[PDB]
Scaffold this active site. Sequence first.
Site, PDB file in Angstrom:
ATOM      1  N   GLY A 194      -5.887  -5.013   2.182  1.00 16.09           N
ATOM      2  CA  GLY A 194      -4.733  -4.910   3.119  1.00 16.09           C
ATOM      3  C   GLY A 194      -4.482  -6.784   3.387  1.00 16.09           C
ATOM      4  O   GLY A 194      -3.505  -6.989   2.978  1.00 16.09           O
ATOM      5  N   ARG A 202       1.013  -1.090   0.058  1.00 16.45           N
ATOM      6  CA  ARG A 202      -0.106  -0.071   0.071  1.00 16.45           C
ATOM      7  C   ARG A 202       0.903   1.695   0.265  1.00 16.45           C
ATOM      8  O   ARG A 202       0.996   2.406  -0.427  1.00 16.45           O
ATOM      9  CB  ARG A 202      -1.340  -0.197   1.005  1.00 16.45           C
ATOM     10  CG  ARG A 202      -2.011  -0.906   0.861  1.00 16.45           C
ATOM     11  CD  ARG A 202      -3.238  -0.994   1.929  1.00 16.45           C
ATOM     12  NE  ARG A 202      -4.361  -1.456   1.355  1.00 16.45           N
ATOM     13  CZ  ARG A 202      -5.866  -2.057   2.460  1.00 16.45           C
ATOM     14  NH1 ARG A 202      -5.230  -0.964   3.900  1.00 16.45           N
ATOM     15  NH2 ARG A 202      -6.861  -1.980   1.976  1.00 16.45           N
ATOM     16  N   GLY A 216     -12.448  -3.968   0.920  1.00 10.41           N
ATOM     17  CA  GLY A 216     -13.567  -3.800   1.270  1.00 10.41           C
ATOM     18  C   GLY A 216     -14.660  -3.213   0.115  1.00 10.41           C
ATOM     19  O   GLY A 216     -15.145  -2.771  -1.086  1.00 10.41           O
ATOM     20  N   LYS A 271     -14.089  -8.438   9.324  1.00 14.32           N
ATOM     21  CA  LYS A 271     -15.129  -7.638   8.876  1.00 14.32           C
ATOM     22  C   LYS A 271     -16.541  -7.769   8.701  1.00 14.32           C
ATOM     23  O   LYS A 271     -16.855  -7.525   7.015  1.00 14.32           O
ATOM     24  CB  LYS A 271     -14.238  -6.555   7.726  1.00 14.32           C
ATOM     25  CG  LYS A 271     -13.369  -5.650   8.849  1.00 14.32           C
ATOM     26  CD  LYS A 271     -12.338  -4.800   7.846  1.00 14.32           C
ATOM     27  CE  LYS A 271     -10.707  -4.095   8.333  1.00 14.32           C
ATOM     28  NZ  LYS A 271     -10.322  -3.387   7.885  1.00 14.32           N
TER      29      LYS A 271
HETATM   30  N1  ATP Z   1     -11.628 -17.449  11.245  1.00 11.49           N
HETATM   31  C1  ATP Z   1     -11.564 -16.980  11.601  1.00 11.49           C
HETATM   32  N2  ATP Z   1     -11.737 -16.028  12.879  1.00 11.49           N
HETATM   33  C2  ATP Z   1     -11.053 -14.381  13.203  1.00 11.49           C
HETATM   34  N3  ATP Z   1     -10.832 -14.256  12.190  1.00 11.49           N
HETATM   35  C3  ATP Z   1     -10.611 -14.679  10.750  1.00 11.49           C
HETATM   36  C4  ATP Z   1     -11.064 -15.579  10.564  1.00 11.49           C
HETATM   37  N4  ATP Z   1     -10.604 -15.590   9.461  1.00 11.49           N
HETATM   38  C5  ATP Z   1     -10.348 -15.105   8.465  1.00 11.49           C
HETATM   39  N5  ATP Z   1      -9.996 -13.872   9.842  1.00 11.49           N
HETATM   40  C6  ATP Z   1      -9.322 -12.519   9.727  1.00 11.49           C
HETATM   41  O1  ATP Z   1      -9.499 -11.189   8.890  1.00 11.49           O
HETATM   42  C7  ATP Z   1      -9.011 -10.257   8.804  1.00 11.49           C
HETATM   43  C8  ATP Z   1      -8.637  -9.815   7.412  1.00 11.49           C
HETATM   44  O2  ATP Z   1      -9.990  -9.556   7.458  1.00 11.49           O
HETATM   45  P1  ATP Z   1     -10.683  -7.988   6.243  1.00 11.49           P
HETATM   46  O3  ATP Z   1     -11.977  -7.737   6.170  1.00 11.49           O
HETATM   47  O4  ATP Z   1      -9.591  -6.646   7.274  1.00 11.49           O
HETATM   48  O5  ATP Z   1      -9.479  -8.270   5.035  1.00 11.49           O
HETATM   49  P2  ATP Z   1      -8.814  -7.358   3.807  1.00 11.49           P
HETATM   50  O6  ATP Z   1      -7.860  -8.517   2.654  1.00 11.49           O
HETATM   51  O7  ATP Z   1      -7.683  -6.920   5.377  1.00 11.49           O
HETATM   52  O8  ATP Z   1      -9.912  -6.555   3.682  1.00 11.49           O
HETATM   53  P3  ATP Z   1      -9.743  -4.995   3.573  1.00 11.49           P
HETATM   54  O9  ATP Z   1      -9.053  -4.877   2.039  1.00 11.49           O
HETATM   55  O10 ATP Z   1     -11.189  -4.610   3.328  1.00 11.49           O
HETATM   56  O11 ATP Z   1      -9.133  -4.834   5.060  1.00 11.49           O
HETATM   57  C9  ATP Z   1      -7.437 -10.969   8.654  1.00 11.49           C
HETATM   58  O12 ATP Z   1      -6.256 -10.330   9.854  1.00 11.49           O
HETATM   59  C10 ATP Z   1      -7.586 -12.828   9.324  1.00 11.49           C
HETATM   60  O13 ATP Z   1      -7.109 -12.727  10.450  1.00 11.49           O
HETATM   61  O1  X15 Z   2      -8.333  -1.531   4.779  1.00 11.02           O
HETATM   62  C1  X15 Z   2      -9.325  -1.469   4.053  1.00 11.02           C
HETATM   63  O2  X15 Z   2     -10.041  -2.157   3.980  1.00 11.02           O
HETATM   64  P1  X15 Z   2      -9.722  -3.979   3.359  1.00 11.02           P
HETATM   65  O3  X15 Z   2      -9.250  -4.436   5.345  1.00 11.02           O
HETATM   66  O4  X15 Z   2     -11.434  -4.462   3.231  1.00 11.02           O
HETATM   67  O5  X15 Z   2      -8.604  -4.168   2.212  1.00 11.02           O
HETATM   68  C2  X15 Z   2      -8.933  -0.145   4.356  1.00 11.02           C
HETATM   69  O6  X15 Z   2      -7.679   1.328   5.037  1.00 11.02           O
HETATM   70  C3  X15 Z   2      -9.876   1.028   4.851  1.00 11.02           C
HETATM   71  O7  X15 Z   2     -10.101   0.367   6.062  1.00 11.02           O
HETATM   72  P2  X15 Z   2     -11.147  -0.223   7.167  1.00 11.02           P
HETATM   73  O8  X15 Z   2     -12.029  -1.278   7.226  1.00 11.02           O
HETATM   74  O9  X15 Z   2     -11.113   0.114   8.421  1.00 11.02           O
HETATM   75  O10 X15 Z   2     -12.923   1.489   7.005  1.00 11.02           O
HETATM   76 MG    MG Z   3      -8.013  -5.366   6.346  1.00  8.37          MG
END
Ligand code: ATP
Ligand code: X15
Ligand code: MG
Length: 408
Positions: free
Chosen positions: A365, A37, A388, A207
């Site tokens: 991320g 990022r 997201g 999330k």
């Molecule tokens: N079964 C689970 N229980 C708890 N946490 C989990 C489980 N499966 C995955 N995760 C957690 O999901 C988290 C990621 O969720 P998240 O929505 O932030 O994904 P992301 O790829 O960073 O999406 P965003 O870019 O929108 O932030 C990871 O830190 C992972 O440890």
């Molecule tokens: O990591 C983010 O989205 P992602 O975990 O879905 O990849 C963005 O930086 C926004 O963070 P947020 O979901 O806390 O507003």
């Molecule tokens: Mg994330």
Amino acid sequence: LSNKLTLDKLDVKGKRVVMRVDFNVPMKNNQITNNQRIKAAVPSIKFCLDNGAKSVVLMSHLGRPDGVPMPDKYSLEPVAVELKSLLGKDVLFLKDCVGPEVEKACANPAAGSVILLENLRFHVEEEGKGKKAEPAKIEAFRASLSKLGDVYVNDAFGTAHRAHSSMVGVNLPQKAGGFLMKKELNYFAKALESPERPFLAILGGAKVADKIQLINNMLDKVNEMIIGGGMAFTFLKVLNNMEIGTSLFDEEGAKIVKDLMSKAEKNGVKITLPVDFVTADKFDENAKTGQATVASGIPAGWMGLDCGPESSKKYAEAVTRAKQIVWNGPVGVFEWEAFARGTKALMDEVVKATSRGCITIIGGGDTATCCAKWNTEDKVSHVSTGGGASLELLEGKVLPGVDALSNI
Ligand SMILES: Nc1ncnc2c1ncn2[C@@H]1O[C@H](COP(=O)(O)OP(=O)(O)OP(=O)(O)O)[C@@H](O)[C@H]1O
Ligand SMILES: O=C(OP(=O)(O)O)[C@H](O)COP(=O)(O)O
Ligand SMILES: [Mg+2]
């Protein structure tokens, strides 16, 4: 971005540039696990400097501190250190993002200054709720950020779905999308126009409260959906009355699961949920681990932190049928090896699929860090800095952070 101002049409010579970026980078033992990022914003930053910007003031959030200052856990200081190596310039890190002394520091910087502000979300006015915020203060917060530049650039693609103060509330007469915002939106514009079919969405991660609310609209666009990771437990509990222990659960989303499944059936979207799990007696890398299936349940006080081998097989089957995949959310807590196996196996399947012509898009991320960790970044079609944000494009939405940009 066709009728939005973009950085390539913005005269930045002699101007202070205040720039929203998404530097919400994954962290482990106080260290950045993935600088993707940060690198992604470099082309916009270098453009500004090469074209005679007086300064570039960078602002981002990191994590979800929910309006309290938390430099101990959520400081952007380590990002400033990391940005320095990537740019080949120093960057002045400030310990706040607003106002009087931050404003003084940004008022009239030396030529070519790059400045990184502290975590926006240490102030409740960025979101502006957390742990409930006053409009007058929200207004003041925004005015303060606006003072820090003469022109504004939003390169925060990863945060573009969030109508937060730094993303939609900066009052400058020129608000331009940066080169990362452009690249990401153009790519998705192309990919989402007439996707290859079957089009599979893979949704996991942690999330749940947020991303469960995206499925309804996604169900009008895709032909299959894997629902894994932390997302699955809300579904399994409502549909199969599965015991889930202390696994992630969303009370609100639980209420719409039956509606989502009805719409999926009505729209012919095959939903694949996990059938087995690696369990943990606590939320820790070194937890005692176990195995469970949907039929057996997860015991009292234990939590499902990965899917098991039978789930991986079902996931692989869906990926084999796909001609296009969009994946956001690891299907387990991949940062911890005891729970990385399900996400690693899905990655292998997604890379195999890419090699026979599947269009494969991995975003987020944390999910893009899966690619870094297993060195598959060049082995899928596209790794996006948005998770997201990408899911909201798949929904067919205009992103608030793009919507708030100036029209040409
Ligand atoms: N079964 C689970 N229980 C708890 N946490 C989990 C489980 N499966 C995955 N995760 C957690 O999901 C988290 C990621 O969720 P998240 O929505 O932030 O994904 P992301 O790829 O960073 O999406 P965003 O870019 O929108 O932030 C990871 O830190 C992972 O440890
Ligand atoms: O990591 C983010 O989205 P992602 O975990 O879905 O990849 C963005 O930086 C926004 O963070 P947020 O979901 O806390 O507003
Ligand atoms: Mg994330």
